[PDB]
Design a protein around this ligand. Structure first.
Ligand SMILES: CC(C)NCc1ccc(N(C)C)cc1
Length: 165
């Protein structure tokens, strides 16, 4: 199962790891993607997860959008996990670089509560522009299920652990 994680709370764990490498190793039931409303997996975590699936995640996502239309900011959908996981939970955190409301970050993390255990990135962090320290705080105060957070950047991982209240 999950190894090498630091326990932050009763249900939140954290590790300095590449979420693609972590997914290929653990083969979790659920891997969370840092999705946008269009499921266009171009960059950041989404671009990396999609590249690992040889673009199969993008082909499946385009069919999902053609049928259902875009997701809401704060919303999610469950699609295949391809070669990375049983399922991928595509969760849309607000992208503050696109002017999306940061208050929707709690709604985005609420989607994790529908799954007993997840491998996930910090929502709205990285290219989504939010403060990752704030994202971790919203995560621990919102998610009640078991979440294993993979933080790619070592320097950010160290800052997140050393500043965790
Ligand atoms: C039971 C859990 C640890 N693994 C579920 C599971 C997830 C993904 C895959 N593959 C082959 C991508 C296989 C199995």
């Amino acid at each position: 199962s999950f190894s090498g994680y630091l326990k932050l709370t009763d249900n939140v764990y954290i590790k300095n790891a590449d979420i693609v490498e972590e997914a290929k190793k653990v083969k979790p039931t659920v891997v969370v993607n840092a999705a946008n409303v269009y499921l266009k997996h171009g960059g950041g975590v989404a671009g990396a997860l999609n590249k690992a699936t040889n673009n199969a995640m993008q082909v499946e996502s385009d069919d999902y959008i053609a049928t259902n239309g875009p997701l809401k900011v704060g919303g999610s959908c469950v699609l295949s996990g391809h070669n990375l996981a049983k399922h991928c939970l595509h969760v849309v955190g607000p992208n503050v670089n696109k002017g999306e409301d940061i208050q929707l970050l709690k709604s985005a993390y609420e989607n994790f509560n529908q799954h007993e255990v997840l491998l996930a990135p910090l929502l709205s962090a990285g290219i989504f522009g939010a403060d990752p320290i704030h994202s971790l705080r919203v995560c621990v105060d919102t998610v009640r299920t078991n979440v294993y957070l993979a933080v790619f950047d070592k320097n950010l991982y160290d800052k997140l652990v050393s500043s965790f209240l």
